[PDB]
Design an enzyme around this catalytic site. Structure first.
Site, PDB file in Angstrom:
ATOM      1  N   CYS A 109     -27.330  48.050 100.527  1.00  0.00           N
ATOM      2  CA  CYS A 109     -27.819  46.725 100.171  1.00  0.00           C
ATOM      3  C   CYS A 109     -28.177  46.597  98.679  1.00  0.00           C
ATOM      4  O   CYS A 109     -29.072  47.282  98.167  1.00  0.00           O
ATOM      5  CB  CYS A 109     -29.058  46.369 101.009  1.00  0.00           C
ATOM      6  SG  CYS A 109     -29.731  44.735 100.586  1.00  0.00           S
ATOM      7  N   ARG A 112     -32.052  44.766  97.436  1.00  0.00           N
ATOM      8  CA  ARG A 112     -33.354  45.363  97.675  1.00  0.00           C
ATOM      9  C   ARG A 112     -34.502  45.059  96.714  1.00  0.00           C
ATOM     10  O   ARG A 112     -35.631  45.441  96.982  1.00  0.00           O
ATOM     11  CB  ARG A 112     -33.181  46.868  97.900  1.00  0.00           C
ATOM     12  CG  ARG A 112     -32.535  47.175  99.259  1.00  0.00           C
ATOM     13  CD  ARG A 112     -32.268  48.657  99.443  1.00  0.00           C
ATOM     14  NE  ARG A 112     -31.095  49.113  98.705  1.00  0.00           N
ATOM     15  CZ  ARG A 112     -30.866  50.387  98.387  1.00  0.00           C
ATOM     16  NH1 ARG A 112     -31.747  51.326  98.743  1.00  0.00           N
ATOM     17  NH2 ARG A 112     -29.756  50.729  97.733  1.00  0.00           N
ATOM     18  N   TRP A 281     -29.907  35.980 101.906  1.00  0.00           N
ATOM     19  CA  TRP A 281     -29.044  34.954 101.332  1.00  0.00           C
ATOM     20  C   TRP A 281     -27.843  35.689 100.757  1.00  0.00           C
ATOM     21  O   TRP A 281     -27.912  36.883 100.475  1.00  0.00           O
ATOM     22  CB  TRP A 281     -29.772  34.111 100.286  1.00  0.00           C
ATOM     23  CG  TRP A 281     -30.380  34.839  99.162  1.00  0.00           C
ATOM     24  CD1 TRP A 281     -29.740  35.368  98.073  1.00  0.00           C
ATOM     25  CD2 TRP A 281     -31.772  35.102  98.982  1.00  0.00           C
ATOM     26  NE1 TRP A 281     -30.654  35.936  97.224  1.00  0.00           N
ATOM     27  CE2 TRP A 281     -31.911  35.790  97.755  1.00  0.00           C
ATOM     28  CE3 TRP A 281     -32.919  34.825  99.739  1.00  0.00           C
ATOM     29  CZ2 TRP A 281     -33.150  36.204  97.265  1.00  0.00           C
ATOM     30  CZ3 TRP A 281     -34.164  35.242  99.253  1.00  0.00           C
ATOM     31  CH2 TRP A 281     -34.263  35.924  98.022  1.00  0.00           C
ATOM     32  N   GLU A 286     -19.350  38.109  98.533  1.00  0.00           N
ATOM     33  CA  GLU A 286     -19.161  38.359  99.960  1.00  0.00           C
ATOM     34  C   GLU A 286     -18.279  37.244 100.539  1.00  0.00           C
ATOM     35  O   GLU A 286     -17.387  37.495 101.363  1.00  0.00           O
ATOM     36  CB  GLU A 286     -20.510  38.369 100.691  1.00  0.00           C
ATOM     37  CG  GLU A 286     -21.401  39.556 100.376  1.00  0.00           C
ATOM     38  CD  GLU A 286     -22.761  39.408 101.031  1.00  0.00           C
ATOM     39  OE1 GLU A 286     -23.654  38.777 100.420  1.00  0.00           O
ATOM     40  OE2 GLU A 286     -22.922  39.898 102.170  1.00  0.00           O
TER      41      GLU A 286
HETATM   42  C1  HEM Z   1     -32.286  38.612 100.036  1.00  0.00           C
HETATM   43  C2  HEM Z   1     -30.924  38.687  99.852  1.00  0.00           C
HETATM   44  C3  HEM Z   1     -30.071  39.754 100.085  1.00  0.00           C
HETATM   45  C4  HEM Z   1     -28.892  39.968  99.423  1.00  0.00           C
HETATM   46  C5  HEM Z   1     -28.293  39.129  98.298  1.00  0.00           C
HETATM   47  C6  HEM Z   1     -28.259  41.099 100.060  1.00  0.00           C
HETATM   48  C7  HEM Z   1     -26.945  41.535  99.748  1.00  0.00           C
HETATM   49  C8  HEM Z   1     -26.259  42.527 100.433  1.00  0.00           C
HETATM   50  C9  HEM Z   1     -24.887  42.896 100.160  1.00  0.00           C
HETATM   51  C10 HEM Z   1     -24.005  42.345  99.014  1.00  0.00           C
HETATM   52  C11 HEM Z   1     -24.582  43.856 101.076  1.00  0.00           C
HETATM   53  C12 HEM Z   1     -23.216  44.543 101.327  1.00  0.00           C
HETATM   54  C13 HEM Z   1     -22.676  43.660 102.448  1.00  0.00           C
HETATM   55  C14 HEM Z   1     -21.217  43.894 102.770  1.00  0.00           C
HETATM   56  O1  HEM Z   1     -20.422  44.142 101.834  1.00  0.00           O
HETATM   57  O2  HEM Z   1     -20.860  43.806 103.969  1.00  0.00           O
HETATM   58  C15 HEM Z   1     -25.752  44.087 101.904  1.00  0.00           C
HETATM   59  C16 HEM Z   1     -25.812  45.045 102.958  1.00  0.00           C
HETATM   60  C17 HEM Z   1     -26.973  45.311 103.733  1.00  0.00           C
HETATM   61  N1  HEM Z   1     -28.186  44.614 103.620  1.00  0.00           N
HETATM   62 FE1  HEM Z   1     -28.723  43.311 102.174  1.00  0.00          FE
HETATM   63  N2  HEM Z   1     -29.055  41.626 101.103  1.00  0.00           N
HETATM   64  C18 HEM Z   1     -30.160  40.768 101.152  1.00  0.00           C
HETATM   65  C19 HEM Z   1     -31.156  40.794 102.173  1.00  0.00           C
HETATM   66  C20 HEM Z   1     -31.264  41.732 103.187  1.00  0.00           C
HETATM   67  C21 HEM Z   1     -32.293  41.751 104.208  1.00  0.00           C
HETATM   68  C22 HEM Z   1     -33.385  40.713 104.488  1.00  0.00           C
HETATM   69  C23 HEM Z   1     -32.077  42.905 104.953  1.00  0.00           C
HETATM   70  C24 HEM Z   1     -32.854  43.446 105.997  1.00  0.00           C
HETATM   71  C25 HEM Z   1     -34.199  43.264 106.251  1.00  0.00           C
HETATM   72  C26 HEM Z   1     -30.852  43.529 104.419  1.00  0.00           C
HETATM   73  C27 HEM Z   1     -30.237  44.647 104.949  1.00  0.00           C
HETATM   74  C28 HEM Z   1     -28.982  45.159 104.595  1.00  0.00           C
HETATM   75  C29 HEM Z   1     -28.321  46.261 105.268  1.00  0.00           C
HETATM   76  C30 HEM Z   1     -28.841  47.179 106.385  1.00  0.00           C
HETATM   77  C31 HEM Z   1     -27.078  46.330 104.743  1.00  0.00           C
HETATM   78  C32 HEM Z   1     -25.892  47.194 105.176  1.00  0.00           C
HETATM   79  C33 HEM Z   1     -25.274  46.775 106.495  1.00  0.00           C
HETATM   80  C34 HEM Z   1     -23.864  47.321 106.687  1.00  0.00           C
HETATM   81  O3  HEM Z   1     -23.597  48.493 106.331  1.00  0.00           O
HETATM   82  O4  HEM Z   1     -23.015  46.572 107.211  1.00  0.00           O
HETATM   83  N3  HEM Z   1     -30.342  42.815 103.320  1.00  0.00           N
HETATM   84  N4  HEM Z   1     -26.802  43.281 101.487  1.00  0.00           N
HETATM   85  C1  LIG Z   2     -29.031  40.337 105.409  1.00  0.00           C
HETATM   86  C2  LIG Z   2     -27.714  40.288 104.642  1.00  0.00           C
HETATM   87  C3  LIG Z   2     -27.627  39.520 103.398  1.00  0.00           C
HETATM   88  C4  LIG Z   2     -26.344  39.492 102.694  1.00  0.00           C
HETATM   89  N1  LIG Z   2     -26.194  38.815 101.556  1.00  0.00           N
HETATM   90  N2  LIG Z   2     -25.269  40.184 103.225  1.00  0.00           N
HETATM   91  C5  LIG Z   2     -25.322  40.928 104.413  1.00  0.00           C
HETATM   92  C6  LIG Z   2     -24.029  41.637 104.895  1.00  0.00           C
HETATM   93  C7  LIG Z   2     -23.300  40.759 106.018  1.00  0.00           C
HETATM   94  C8  LIG Z   2     -22.812  39.390 105.447  1.00  0.00           C
HETATM   95  N3  LIG Z   2     -21.561  39.712 104.710  1.00  0.00           N
HETATM   96  C9  LIG Z   2     -20.945  40.958 105.310  1.00  0.00           C
HETATM   97  C10 LIG Z   2     -21.947  41.353 106.461  1.00  0.00           C
HETATM   98  N4  LIG Z   2     -21.991  42.823 106.590  1.00  0.00           N
HETATM   99  C11 LIG Z   2     -20.927  43.438 107.432  1.00  0.00           C
HETATM  100  C12 LIG Z   2     -20.607  44.846 106.988  1.00  0.00           C
HETATM  101  N5  LIG Z   2     -19.649  45.394 107.982  1.00  0.00           N
HETATM  102  C13 LIG Z   2     -19.540  46.863 107.866  1.00  0.00           C
HETATM  103  C14 LIG Z   2     -18.786  47.351 109.100  1.00  0.00           C
HETATM  104  C15 LIG Z   2     -19.410  48.251 110.007  1.00  0.00           C
HETATM  105  C16 LIG Z   2     -18.708  48.692 111.164  1.00  0.00           C
HETATM  106  C17 LIG Z   2     -17.385  48.229 111.409  1.00  0.00           C
HETATM  107 CL1  LIG Z   2     -16.508  48.774 112.850  1.00  0.00          CL
HETATM  108  C18 LIG Z   2     -16.761  47.327 110.498  1.00  0.00           C
HETATM  109  C19 LIG Z   2     -17.462  46.889 109.346  1.00  0.00           C
HETATM  110  C20 LIG Z   2     -26.554  41.011 105.176  1.00  0.00           C
END
Ligand code: HEM
Ligand SMILES: Cc1cc(N)nc(C[C@H]2CNC[C@H]2NCCNCc2ccc(Cl)cc2)c1
Ligand code: HEM
Ligand SMILES: Cc1cc(N)nc(C[C@H]2CNC[C@H]2NCCNCc2ccc(Cl)cc2)c1
Ligand SMILES: C[C@H](O)[C@H](O)[C@H]1CNc2nc(N)[nH]c(=O)c2N1
Ligand SMILES: C[C@H](O)[C@H](O)[C@H]1CNc2nc(N)[nH]c(=O)c2N1
Ligand SMILES: C[As](C)(=O)[O-]
Ligand SMILES: C[As](C)(=O)[O-]
Ligand SMILES: [Zn+2]
EC number: 1.14.13.39
Lengths: 405, 402
Positions: A109, A112, A281, A286
């Protein structure tokens, strides 16, 4: 020098050492023989207790009462509860602290810097799929807040020994349907074909558009999942237009405002919250780069390049790069127009560098997945590209879990 | 045991079995991954030599033959008596090609089998090193039709200094520290520019002043040699549609030739073995010209494009970057000098991964380096999982000789 990983920033020439990694109690996928850092995917009262004690120590350290009477009493309380029941329960403030730590600990993320500001909705009293839906709707309303988004997580009952899990089947609270066509293609989001068919298999009458919001398949313990349609007034969407290319609006593209992950498991002190949706947000790439331009997603690059009249016959015209930039600009412009919170990849990475400096001081390091932190477009134009990073697993944590079906 | 490797765009999966052949440790451990770090924090020689000789004979499909066995005896006899051995030219050529093939950070490996190898092991002075280097450049440059090549100087020897080329590349632009702490030229080359002056070089005052070479023969102070201008091909940068671009007075040399890495083959170490191929446009257009700590021309180009540099949300940086990379491709194409764009390059790398999966059961690759610095996910490699590990023969980093 110091026997910890030496981390260097090549733009600034600055050096730091990560000592926080010493707190990691779970192994990742790499070994001295080979790095698997680019891969997307990675009870015994005995082990639970040690994880529980570690968590309670983390909690008391965070409130500056480590070693105190209350700290020792809580530890004895947790041991006794596990002793007699096999599990234990967190106090309200412990859950709040744990949820924020899990976000703070998420290596992938980039958002953070915001970790300390998270609205934690305690829904551990939830006892039915219908109620799960109520909690989810309130979450969406609070988090959406008419476009001025607020980070939030709603925690449903933890996994219990000898009982089914609470589960949200969808990967996100809001996602667009993907309809497999006759010709084998897909109308809508190709990423959601399976969930879309599961919704149909479950009684959902499917639409036929490119951006149909999917219903939620909610599952209470030991019951089949129930289907719930989100009231349209609750799902804020943003129609996409470009600041100068007038024809972009005619493309009919759009995206929803709230990114809310709903299929991850929140682990705190050995306890496992199988249903605990969280949202923040979007970072513009993304939507504009991955969701809209991935070849296996909406794949709209060629359409936009044709509109811009680019030479899509040769790679060297850089038509893909040109169209991608305009699509990302449109996303930023449209969200800004509609007054919906969003952050571009430059601002986001700049704030993440600040977060790293804050954490170096507060904890001696910050677990970060370089491949995921660096944006999908303009990588080296952002400061994180030039920052070496150390990746490791800390708990509390958000973990992937197998699909319930 | 063997890692499952998935491509998320296509859904295809493979298993890397080649990594089991790694004998050298990387920086990672089960506790923490350090894959994003740029640099790492007689019985053995003989085993490395045997493995290499084994590799060689298997390569010519003569494994087990009489020649294979006699060669193994030769190596053993030499190590037992002298503590080292020497490679035959054929083996050296096979070795250099394998080191390129095994380089995890190289996206141009589909070209691995096409490499001109110059044996310079009969070099006894810096002056001779210079003659070999000039011939390498002339050959590799080929008037713009670049050809990949490597020149191998004498291997390291016990109790004797190394043959070394002090420059990190055969062609590099000077970086001069100005009074006001700024830098004229390439900021990445300040230290080497200063060493050259200290070693008697008469500096220039331009932004693209080709540096002279500091070549060092064993246990001698390095010597200075100025490359003949007509040997250093350069490309003036202009834009296909923005007339004012050329006014920026930007240019870049045609030949990317790394000269400070160590080539390791069968336990032997070649401390001076410069190699060159041709550029992938983003190296020049994105990193060299746009890195904050390099020429840093983004803002200048942005203003010339009259972009809104007031906020990041206008994506002015992204916009300028694309035009700069476009100018590089246009210019090299105009000057008829070999160059490959990042889309074409990554597409060829995907083919290479497939070729190698069939040939060896895998391909060591460093994802963070293979994925281009701009438009990462717009290229196929972004969606491809990769396994990174160290195979030998190998190219590796070594301490700066000063
Ligand atoms: C406040 C705005 C936030 C922004 C702009 C943000 C942005 C991002 C981005 C760019 C990613 C990579 C997503 C992807 O490529 O699929 C990500 C992953 C992640 N975010 Fe954040 N995030 C935010 C808030 C949060 C919040 C509120 C939580 C949890 C309380 C969180 C938990 C995570 C986790 C666990 C991942 C990884 C999930 C995965 O591997 O699919 N994020 N976030
Ligand atoms: C709270 C929050 C805030 C923001 N800005 N972004 C996110 C990330 C969420 C919205 N865009 C991509 C989504 N994550 C999917 C990642 N897939 C990995 C993945 C894991 C496992 C498999 Cl099988 C496939 C792919 C969460
Ligand atoms: C023929 C065209 C070639 C192209 C397009 C190509 C492209 C590249 C690129 C883009 C990188 C990453 C560069 C960076 O960001 O610093 C790289 C690294 C590398 N290449 Fe290639 N390459 C080619 C030929 C060769 C040849 C001929 C050799 C050796 C015989 C070679 C050996 C390597 C090695 C060892 C690295 C990593 C060096 C380091 O870590 O600093 N390449 N190449
Ligand atoms: C044969 C060939 C062909 C092409 N196209 N590209 C290359 C790569 C070469 C030209 N541009 C970047 C150079 N690589 C230097 C890596 N520096 C890392 C690094 C290592 C160590 C330190 Cl202290 C700093 C930085 C080689
Ligand atoms: C194969 C590779 O790991 C995969 O495509 C990763 C790379 N980096 C990423 N980074 C982010 N933020 N999100 C992703 O989905 C990915 N996908
Ligand atoms: C810190 C980080 O590893 C560093 O900036 C890397 C990232 N990826 C790279 N990729 C390539 N091709 N070349 C580089 O110099 C780098 N630098
Ligand atoms: C520009 As539209 C088709
Ligand atoms: C040089 As200005 C446009
Ligand atoms: Zn690793």
């Amino acid at each position: 020098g110091p026997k910890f990983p030496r981390v260097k920033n090549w733009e600034l020439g600055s050096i730091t050492y990560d000592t926080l990694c010493a707190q990691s109690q779970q192994d990742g996928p790499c070994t001295p023989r080979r790095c698997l850092g680019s891969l997307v995917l990675p009870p015994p009262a005995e082990q639970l207790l040690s994880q529980a004690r570690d968590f309670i120590n983390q909690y008391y350290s965070s409130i500056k009462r480590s070693g105190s009477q209350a700290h020792e009493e809580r530890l004895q309380e947790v041991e006794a509860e596990v002793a007699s029941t096999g599990t234990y329960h967190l106090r309200e403030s412990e859950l709040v602290f744990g949820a924020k730590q899990a976000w703070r600990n998420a290596p992938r993320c980039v958002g953070r810097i915001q970790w300390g500001k998270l609205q934690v909705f305690d829904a551990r009293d939830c006892s039915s799929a219908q109620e799960m839906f109520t909690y989810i709707c309130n979450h969406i309303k609070y988090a959406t807040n008419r476009g001025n988004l607020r980070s939030a997580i709603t925690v449903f009952p933890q996994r219990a020994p000898g009982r089914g899990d609470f589960r949200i089947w969808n990967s996100q609270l809001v996602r667009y349907a993907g309809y497999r066509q006759q010709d084998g293609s897909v109308r809508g989001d190709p990423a959601n074909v399976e969930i879309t068919e599961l919704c149909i298999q479950h009684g959902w009458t499917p639409g036929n558009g490119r951006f149909d919001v999917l219903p939620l398949l909610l599952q209470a313990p030991d019951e089949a999942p129930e289907l719930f349609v989100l009231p349209p007034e609750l799902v804020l969407e943003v129609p996409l237009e470009h600041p100068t290319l007038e024809w972009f609006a005619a493309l009919g593209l759009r995206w929803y405002a709230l990114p809310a992950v709903s299929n991850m498991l929140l682990e705190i002190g050995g306890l496992e919250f199988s249903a605990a949706p969280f949202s923040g947000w979007y970072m513009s790439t993304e939507i504009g780069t991955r969701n809209l331009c991935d070849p296996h997603r909406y794949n709209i690059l060629e359409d936009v390049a044709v509109c811009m009249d680019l030479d899509t016959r040769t790679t060297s015209s850089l038509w893909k790069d040109k169209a991608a930039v305009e699509i990302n600009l449109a996303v930023l412009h449209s969200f800004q127009l509609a007054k919906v919170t969003i952050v571009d990849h430059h601002a986001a990475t700049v704030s993440f560098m600040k977060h790293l400096d804050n954490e170096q001081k507060a904890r001696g390091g910050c677990p970060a997945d370089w491949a995921w932190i660096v944006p999908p477009i303009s990588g080296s134009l952002t400061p994180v590209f030039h920052q070496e990073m150390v990746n490791y697993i800390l708990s509390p944590a958000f973990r992937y879990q197998p699909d319930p079906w």
